[PDB]
């Protein structure tokens, strides 16, 4: 049926087993070292031509299917360079890996359009990214490049299109002693595998998630789509507070702002319309990126939480 059936694969936990596509490379080896020191079950990795070897005391496989069969992994992280990272996603989709997190930035947009064509016609594999820091369950599982030092298991679910700006929000929520329930970085590419609505459905159905922080930016309509979704599924009584920040009100139009998806073209994708849409949906939009932790704080106090 619908590809939205794989939304449940976003919520990694202490039982998630991970293999690293691009295990031998410098980027894959570095972040795999950390995932072991953080306490996540990084159980293997793939590197064509090096199957059967031992990397960091762990088995190296030639293909994803060999890795999934011999390790029982339910998640995959991708560090393959941009020329081949889209094919790495396709291999994981055909291997029916439940969750695949693509950290690689710089994948050609045409490649991701093709990947999107295949991804949207299956149920088994849920894709996060590309050009994303990943997903982290604080204290249980960490898939990606986010610094787990600043995360504390708490009550706020975070979904963002940025990387370091996401860390700033995590640090703010921790400094006010609230913590995070699940942080998902959907990436800054125009064609990704997970949008805001996919994470909001998980957050609004999670008992551990009492508040939500949505961090967006210029480009696309995902923020406006999330506003309409929240206005129909998170309104009236027993609704969860959503605090947001949109970056790019000072961005010049027609210019790519680092991220491949941060662009204002044809009078569309501006940050003002996104702020206007989220506010009309009941979301409290913070004008300063330094006040998201305090905004979600006093939004909890106005409801004695």
């Amino acid at each position: 049926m619908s590809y939205t059936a794989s939304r449940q694969h976003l919520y990694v936990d202490k039982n998630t087993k991970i293999i690293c596509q691009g295990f031998t490379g410098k980027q894959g080896t570095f972040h795999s070292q950390q995932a072991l020191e953080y306490g996540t079950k990084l159980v293997g990795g793939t590197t064509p031509g090096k199957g059967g070897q031992t990397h960091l005391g762990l088995p190296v496989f030639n293909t994803v299917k060999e890795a999934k069969e011999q390790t029982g992994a339910t998640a995959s992280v991708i560090y393959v360079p941009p020329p081949f990272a889209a094919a790495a996603i396709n291999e994981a989709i055909e291997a029916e890996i439940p969750l695949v997190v693509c950290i690689t930035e710089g994948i050609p947009q045409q490649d991701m359009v093709r990947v999107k064509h295949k991804l949207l016609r299956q149920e088994k594999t849920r894709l996060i990214g590309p050009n994303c820091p990943g997903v982290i369950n604080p204290g249980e599982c960490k898939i990606g490049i986010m610094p787990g030092h600043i995360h504390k298991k708490g009550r706020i679910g975070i979904v963002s299109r940025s990387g370091t700006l996401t860390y700033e929000a995590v640090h703010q929520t921790t400094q006010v002693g609230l913590g995070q329930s699940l942080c998902v970085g959907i990436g800054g590419d125009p064609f990704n595998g997970t949008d805001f609505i996919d994470c909001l459905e998980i957050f609004l159905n999670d008992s551990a998630t009492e508040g939500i922080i949505l961090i967006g930016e210029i480009g696309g309509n995902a923020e406006e789509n999330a506003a309409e979704f929240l206005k129909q599924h998170n309104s009236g009584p027993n609704s969860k507070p959503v605090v947001s920040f949109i970056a790019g009100l000072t961005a010049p139009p027609g210019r790519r702002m680092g991220h491949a998806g941060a662009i204002i073209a044809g009078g569309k994708g501006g940050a003002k319309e996104k702020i206007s849409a989220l506010q009309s949906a009941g979301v409290v939009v913070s004008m300063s990126p330094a006040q998201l932790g305090t905004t979600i704080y006093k939004e909890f106090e106005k409801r004695k939480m």
Binding site: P83, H117, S162, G163, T166, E168, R256, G258, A265
Partner: protein, 393 residues
């Protein structure tokens, strides 16, 4: 990447897409030569800047119709070597070192045609409208029914029936719907071959002889595909040093890692009364040379009065800033805000090792500081006095 108008029209020439005959003049004398080679009569002069603005020489408008080679030389005199100033260029502008001297075409009917990757369709889309020759955003708001969109399956490619049906709905006369569809199919091939994010032709037109012709061509390329687009990407020093940098009209420098945090840093500066001078993303894997070239880029602008660097990681990052400040002889205030490994040792590094660098912990705090310091410098310049700062522990 983006190419000059003439560089685009050359690409559609190589793909069989018919284009008005034109040649490029990089000097006023060769504009005379091209104009005489076209008939010495009706000739169009198109400025090539990377169009409805004002030049620095006083001439408003980038495209002018002249009727003699002598007039073609004189009009290009006020274009080549001069800068144009539009709303998209800000207070500054773009330099015009060449003009496109092409033939004059007399259109019967102007249409709009574009091929772009739309997120709402998750793939390529053909855009068509009978309201060509005008701005496309204004018609999308006045009469959206005039805009017709046709998605293309990325696997099966474009179908001839798709391009035919769109051409009829756009209002092409039946005798030339096929040649219009053939042009649209050729453009979709160009769209995929060069990894273009959008090919806009405004207007796609029917000739006075009845032929379908593309008068203007705007092509945007996916810079992520530069490794497999050697031909396109061969046609300031930010790109030379590989840093995502975009100069703006503000006067407060910005040095941030992460594109989202860099846009947020620009926003918080505007929120506290300042104006950001640039966008810059050093990102991950930032070596000492990156921040040195990042500082050299921001300080290459004389209007920059203060620099706020905001990095989320801390001693090794601090030593890279201290080294770049001492070599470039930076005299403007620098407010740094570092989060990560060793904040206490890095804050003592910048403080207890010489230069006048202010270290903040909070993002709002650092934003107020860099704005207030820039206003002090502004007031000192207006008062025609020099101010030297002395900073706390």
């Amino acid at each position: 990447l983006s190419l000059h108008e003439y560089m685009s029209m050359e690409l559609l020439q190589e793909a069989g897409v018919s284009v008005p005959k034109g040649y490029v003049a990089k000097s006023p004398d060769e504009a005379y030569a091209i104009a005489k080679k076209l008939g010495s009569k009706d000739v169009v002069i198109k400025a090539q800047v990377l169009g409805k603005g004002t030049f620095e020489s006083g001439l408003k408008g980038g495209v002018k119709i002249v009727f003699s080679p002598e007039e073609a030389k004189a009009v290009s005199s006020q274009m080549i070597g001069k800068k144009l100033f539009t709303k998209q260029t800000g207070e500054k502008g773009r330099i015009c070192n060449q003009v496109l001297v092409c033939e004059r075409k007399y259109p019967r009917r102007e249409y709009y045609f574009a091929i772009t990757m739309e997120r709402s369709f998750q793939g390529p889309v053909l855009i068509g409208s009978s309201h060509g020759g005008v701005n496309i955003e204004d018609v999308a708001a006045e009469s959206p029914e005039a805009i017709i969109k046709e998605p293309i399956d990325i696997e099966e490619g474009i179908k001839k029936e798709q391009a035919l049906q769109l051409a009829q709905k756009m209002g092409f006369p039946p005798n030339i719907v096929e040649s219009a569809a053939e042009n649209m199919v050729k453009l979709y091939s160009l769209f995929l071959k060069y990894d273009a994010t959008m090919i806009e032709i405004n207007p796609m037109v029917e000739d006075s002889d009845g032929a379908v012709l593309c008068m203007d061509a705007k092509i945007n390329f996916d810079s992520n595909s530069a490794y497999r687009q050697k031909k396109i990407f061969d046609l300031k020093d930010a790109a030379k040093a590989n840093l995502n940098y975009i100069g703006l009209d503000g006067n407060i420098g910005c040095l941030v890692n992460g594109a989202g945090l860099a846009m947020a840093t620009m926003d918080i500066i505007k929120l506290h009364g300042g104006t950001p001078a640039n966008f810059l993303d050093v990102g991950g894997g930032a070596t000492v040379h990156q921040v040195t070239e990042a500082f050299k880029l921001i300080t290459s602008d004389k209007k920059v009065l203060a620099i706020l660097v905001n990095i989320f990681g801390c001693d090794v990052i601090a030593q890279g800033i201290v080294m770049a400040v001492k070599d470039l002889e930076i005299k403007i205030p620098v407010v740094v805000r570092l989060q990560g490994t060793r904040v206490d040792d890095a804050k003592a590094l910048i403080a207890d090792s010489g230069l006048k660098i202010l270290a903040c912990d909070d993002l709002d705090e650092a934003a107020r500081m860099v704005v207030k310091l820039s206003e002090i410098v502004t007031l000192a310049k207006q008062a025609h006095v020099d101010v030297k700062f002395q900073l706390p522990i």
